[PDB]
């Protein structure tokens, strides 16, 4: 299917960087802006960030698994393009 939550790189992917800057926003919900944050690939979890975005007033409390996966897909997508 599709999540409708776009997550993309914020800074040029340089490789061998344990932390990456990401940008998240929504285009299909099936503050209405773009959220920029850092993500540690070896330590932090997409579910952890998603909760924080919950406890920060971006999406609903039970909309956590959906945003967690949309971040997890981008983290996957950046490590597969990292071979």
């Amino acid at each position: 299917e599709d999540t409708g939550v776009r997550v993309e790189l914020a800074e040029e992917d340089h490789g061998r960087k344990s932390t990456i800057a990401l940008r998240l926003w929504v285009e299909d919900p099936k503050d209405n802006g773009a959220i920029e944050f850092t993500f540690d690939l070896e330590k932090e979890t997409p579910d952890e960030v998603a909760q924080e975005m919950i406890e920060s007033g971006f999406f609903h409390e039970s909309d956590v698994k959906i945003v967690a996966k949309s971040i997890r897909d981008r983290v996957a997508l950046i490590q597969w393009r990292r071979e």
Binding site: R23, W25, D31, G33, A34, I35, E36, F37, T38, V49, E52, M53, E55, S56, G57
Partner: peptide, 17 residues
């Protein structure tokens, strides 16, 4: 453009794009 701090420390930057 605003910065949003979660009570645990993570800083978000909110932008229009």
């Amino acid at each position: 453009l605003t910065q949003v701090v979660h009570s645990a420390g993570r800083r978000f930057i909110v932008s229009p794009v």
